[model samples]
Target: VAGPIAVGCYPALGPTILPSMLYAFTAEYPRASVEFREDTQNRLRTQLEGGELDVAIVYDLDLSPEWQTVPLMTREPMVVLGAEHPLAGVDGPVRLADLAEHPMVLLDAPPSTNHAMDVCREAGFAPRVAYRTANFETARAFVGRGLGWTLLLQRPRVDVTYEGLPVVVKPIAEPKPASVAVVVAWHQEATLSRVARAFIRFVTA
Candidate 1:
C-alpha cells in the first residue's frame, strides 16, 4: 500500500538527521510521502495532540509520556568556533570554563533553548550570548565568521558552514554534558495506520 505519514521534526535536525532519514523511508516505501511541521517543541507536541501528526522526531529533552517514544541515537554536545579563533589550535579537549570569556551564539528554540546555557552553568559559568537564531545554519555561519562560539548537539558531516567557511569542533573535557537523545514519538492513545507503523521500522533510524 502507498504510505503517508505526517511528521513534525525539530529545527536543528533539518540539516543533520532529517534528510537522509526521510530519504531512506521513502526509498523503502516509494509511494510513501511525508507532511512536515518544522516547528518549535511545544508547537509540534500540540500538533501531535490535535492528531495532525502521525509521529514526531525530536530530542528527548523536556519530553513527556503523553506520547510513546522509540529511542534513536544520542548526539553528544560539542563546541564550535571559527577556524581563526585562538582556542581552535588546542592540542586536545578544552574545559568548558576556558570558553567563558568568549561570547556565544545560541540556538534559541524553546524547551531546549537553555540546554547549552545550563551546560555552561554546570561547568561553572554563564555563557555570554552574543546572538540567538532559530536557524541552525545561521548559528554556524556566525561561528564561521569568528563572531562567537556555539554549543551544538548535532554535528554536521563537514566542519564548514553554509558559506563554506571552516569551523573547529572540540570536545568538552571537564564537566561533560549529558548526551542528547533523539527519538521518534507518537500519540499515546492513537491507533496507528500501517504507514505510520512502518515508520518505526526505519532502516536508517
Candidate 2:
C-alpha cells in the first residue's frame, strides 16, 4: 500500500472538479489515502515547493520557474452579474468596453483579482471596483444583489447565487478574453510518490 499522498488545490476548483477527481482516484486505488488542502493558488504553490504537499492543482498564473506543470484545461474568462443588470439583457457575447461602465465585484483572492484586473486593463479600461471578497460565493451574492459585476474563468451550471437569486454569465468577446490554464504543479526538485503520480495521471486523463 502507498502512503498518504498530499494534495492541494485552489478553493474555486474544490467544489466542482476536485470532488469527482477524488472519487475516481480513491475508487481506483482503494488502499491509497489522500491529504487535501484547499486555498489560494499562491499559498498552494508555496506548500508544493516547501515539500508540504506532494502535488497541486492550480491556475497557471504568475508561477515560478522551479515548478514542473502539466496543463489540465484552458478556461476563457466570462462576465457574471445579477440577472436584472442592464447589460445582462444584451444579446450575444458581452464586449470588454461595455463591462467598463459597471461597478466591479472582484474576487480578492491573490492572483485572481490581479488577473481579472489585468484582463480589463488589456481591454482598455480600468474596472471601477465597488467590492472585493476572498470567497467566490460572497462575490456571487454581491453580484446577485445588483451591487457589481465580476469576471470569472469557470462557469457553474446553475445561474443562481447562493441566496437563490438569478444571475447571468456571459462570455467576453473583445481584446481576446484572458484564458486561464488549470494545471497540476509539483516541485522540480521533488520526486512524486507512486500514489501521487497515479492520482495526477488519473485527473489529467
Candidate 3:
C-alpha cells in the first residue's frame, strides 16, 4: 500500500472525478504515493502499453483487445440542445428521429465522437454534424447558441453553458446503444505490479 502508483486518464474523465478518487485512494491507504497523468486516449494507450502507467482510465468504448479492463461506472447518454430548440422542453425522452433535420455539434474526442455517431446510426439516421470540437465546454457553448445539438455521456451539474447561455439536457429514447461505461485498464500482456494490483482492487472494491 505504500508503493508509488502511476495512473493515466483521458481528459474527459480526468478533470471531474479523478481528483476526488485520488483523494479517497490516498486517504484509505495513507502511505501510498500517487502520480497522475492526463492525455488523449491514443497517447494514454501508448503509455499504458509501454508500462509507463499502472492503470489507464477512460470510457470503455473504442478500446483495443490487448488491454484488460475493469469497469468503474456507467452513465446514460444525454441529448444537449439549445434552450430554445423545439425539442428541448419535451415532456419525455427525446426521440432520435425527431431531431434529424437539425445540425449537430460533435465532441471530437476519441471514443465519444464515434459513440455519438454509433448511437445515431442505431437509431437509423445520420446526424447533420455542423461543428466538431475537442473541448467539452466548447461543444456545450455551440449548443447554447443554437448552432446544433450533441449527445454526451457525462452531464455537468448546471444548466448553463460557459457563455452563460442556457442549455437543456434530455434522456434519449430507448432502442439506443448501451450506456457509456468508464473503465480502469492495464496492458493485458503485462504483469501488474503489487502496487498496481492493490490500487485497482482499492478503486474497484
Give the number of the best model, judged by TM-score: 2
User: Tens-digit lDDT track for model 2 on 1-205?
Assistant: 4679998998988886788888888888889999999977667877887889998888889888888889989999888879889898888888878878789999977678789888888889988988988888888889989998998878777887888998888888866786889988888899878888888788888
lDDT of each: 0.85, 0.85, 0.86
Off by over 4 Å in 1: 203-205
* Residue 111 of model 1, lDDT score: 53
Q: Assess every candidate by TM-score.
A: 0.94, 0.95, 0.93
**Mind giving the per-residue lDDT tens digits that candidate 1 earns over 1-205?**
4767898888887667878888888887899898877888888888998989998889988887788888888877888989988789987877889989998899887655778778988999988888999888898899999999988888888888888899999988877789988888888898998888888777325
Model 3, 1-205: lDDT tens digits are 6889899998878766698889888998888888899989789888887878889888888899988898889998889899888788788889888888889899989878788888899888988888999998899899998999998889887888888999898888867558878888888888888878888898899
Q: Please list the residue runs of candidate 2 whose C-alpha ends up more than 4 Å from where it truly belongs after superposition.
A: none
Note the residue pairs that clash in candidate 2. Answer: none
- Native RMSD of candidate 2 (Å): 1.3
Q: What C-alpha lDDT, on a 0 to 100 scale, does residue 164 get in candidate 2?
A: 90
Greater-TM-score candidate between 1 and 3: 1
Judged by lDDT relative to the true structure, which candidate is superior, 1 or 2?
2
